[PDB]
Design the sequence.
């Protein structure tokens, strides 16, 4: 009884959102899982470093915002920052 | 044990054609064989280190993925 | 009690907020973790996935196909500046290369 | 009899192999080479199939990138033939020799 | 007004061991501090990764040994491994 | 009772207790063994002694008695394994290695 | 404000930097080119540095921010902490 | 009738002189003004420590020296001794910066 968690169903939801009638193979889905894991580890490592530099003991939204700004370029950084900010305000105001 | 002549000359010429090369000298084949053997032993050393640390005998795909990632050559697709 | 409306639905996302929270805790990144950090990270990850998937789907529909394969992901990544510069040092299995021949090698 | 001029089949092959995604080395020779190389670090190792598949993907990507760099170094000197000194210059600049 | 720890005195002891009558400037000592910190963080990060891969919760001597082997080349790896092993046996047998 | 420290127990010059504390506080794992700080201290001391011996030989070669960053750079760049361990670092006030291509020389 | 300071990197300074690199003969078009390169480099570091400074809610750029930026771009620097 | 060195002599002498030394090769004040101008383009009303600008100077000089070495190699590859912009572009392309 050994499981194996993955982001397959969430990637599938996003795909059905942006392309309602296109599918995806299994190897492309493995590529997408690898991509999500890689970017997650990058952002989390950078935020941990930022928290250590300032002698803080907590990872908050500002650490994630600054890590996003340090990692993504230009268009990507701007739009990701806007998306995350909107998400956090929508979450707290609910 | 010339398993390095297993990489034939037409194979190297195919690899060159994919890279956009239009003409190939005759001394290129030995050079690429040397380069490839260097790269391969560099990767396999760390793969076997990762393996024997875990007290296993079978080299797994994740060991190769880690050995590559530590060289700065991340590889997507075998993360399962 | 009440209906357990979760967290990703609260934030209006598709990605899991609780799983990202657990991964941030267990991954040994800091000794405490805020409440908005998983929401922010989930939103960013969903945005990036949607971007790359839209590009890949356009490529797939361009080659008269209905199902994305790794070649389409490679064509999407390598053809965009910011993605190619974010993923400049990754190898996609079964991806191939970009069709490109130097001008001096052509005849005439 | 019909004969193409030297260089036509070259560009035809270039387009063909840049349109494709296959592997360009045969699998059994590469497997034997990998096992022989691993023979010196530890004896009696086993390999999954996905391990050798990953090694092959990585090696082919590396070599194709090196050949692009070599082609640039060749064109810089006003040639069309790649020679070993172009490979040496590309690797020296990348830092792989230095 | 808070103190600032450093490896100055230990580097000085090692220097007086290998070169009994040579001194060292202050800028070279800052270089040596930077070097020690950098190598420490490299080894510790690699050992942490190794411990995470095997689902272990403890950093032991084997993790440090494997990190040393993965980071240093040839001569350096061999001699560092021998030195650390001797140190650990000397420590436990005391 | 009488308290002898850990670095003296292991026969080292570097601090074992400080390395233990840095391994704990640095958030690397949730537990830390007893021999890990000893191993790490021994490795760090070995590397420092290696690089310092090379730098001192360079300094005594240029008829000086006190090591400066130039000597550290000359030691690092002249050894294969050190230059390949530290291939991507910049040492302030270090300079470069004297080296002129052969084709640029006259005649 | 201050504008047009890339010209303060004079031709003799670039010639000296090239001499330390082993260069014997220098084209006349190099200087301009070089300046462009340098500017790009600085813009990539300072940006990162400033991103650290605003994170701590500071207003002065310290040497540690520069060292962190250089390290995160794979250009580690020994001597300043 | 006055003494004149042949072209290339003072250049080699200067090569030896500047490879034997460790000083900085750019004036401090122009570099500081340049750094402040760029920073002002990024965020207004900034301040700087002295060690920060010193670190920036050391890093930038090291970068440019390494680039000039790679450029010299690319130039010698083409059977020249004069470095030209296309060599800088080839070096920066093989390195992976453009």
Sequence:
């Amino acid at each position: 009884r050994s499981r194996k968690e993955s982001y397959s169903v969430y990637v599938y939801k996003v795909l059905k959102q942006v392309h309602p009638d296109t599918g995806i193979s299994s190897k492309a889905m493995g590529i997408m899982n690898s991509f999500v894991n890689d970017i997650f580890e990058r952002i989390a490592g950078e935020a941990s470093r930022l928290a250590h530099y300032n002698k803080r003991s907590t990872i908050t939204s500002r650490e994630i915002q600054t890590a996003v700004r340090l990692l993504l370029p230009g268009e990507l950084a701007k739009h990701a920052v806007s998306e995350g900010t909107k998400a956090v305000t929508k979450y707290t105001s609910a | 044990r010339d398993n390095i002549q297993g990489i034939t000359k037409p194979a190297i010429r195919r690899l060159a054609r994919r890279g956009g090369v239009k003409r190939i000298s005759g001394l290129i084949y030995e050079e690429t064989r040397g380069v490839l053997k260097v790269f391969l032993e560099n990767v396999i050393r760390d793969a076997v280190t990762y393996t024997e640390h875990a007290k296993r005998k079978t080299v797994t795909a994740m060991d190769v993925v880690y050995a590559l990632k530590r060289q700065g050559r991340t590889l997507y697709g075998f993360g399962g | 009690r009440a209906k357990a409306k979760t967290r990703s639905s609260r934030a209006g996302l598709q990605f899991p907020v609780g799983r990202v929270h657990r991964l941030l805790r267990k991954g040994n990144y800091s000794e405490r973790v805020g409440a908005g950090a998983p929401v922010y990270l989930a939103a960013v990850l969903e945005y990036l996935t949607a971007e790359i998937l839209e590009l890949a789907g356009n490529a797939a529909r361009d080659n008269k196909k209905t199902r994305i394969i790794p070649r389409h992901l490679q064509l999407a990544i390598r053809n965009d500046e910011e993605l190619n510069k974010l993923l400049g040092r990754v190898t996609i299995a079964q991806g191939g290369v970009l069709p490109n021949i130097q001008a001096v090698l052509l005849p005439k | 009899p019909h004969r193409y001029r030297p260089g036509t089949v070259a560009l035809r092959e270039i387009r063909r192999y840049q349109k494709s995604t296959e592997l360009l080395i045969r699998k059994l020779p590469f497997q034997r080479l990998v096992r022989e190389i691993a023979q010196d670090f530890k004896t009696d190792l086993r390999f999954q199939s996905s391990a050798v598949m990953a090694l092959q993907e990585a090696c082919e990507a590396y070599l194709v990138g090196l050949f692009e760099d070599t082609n640039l170094c060749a064109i810089h000197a006003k040639r069309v033939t790649i020679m070993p000194k172009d490979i040496q210059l590309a690797r020296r600049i990348r830092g792989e020799r230095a």
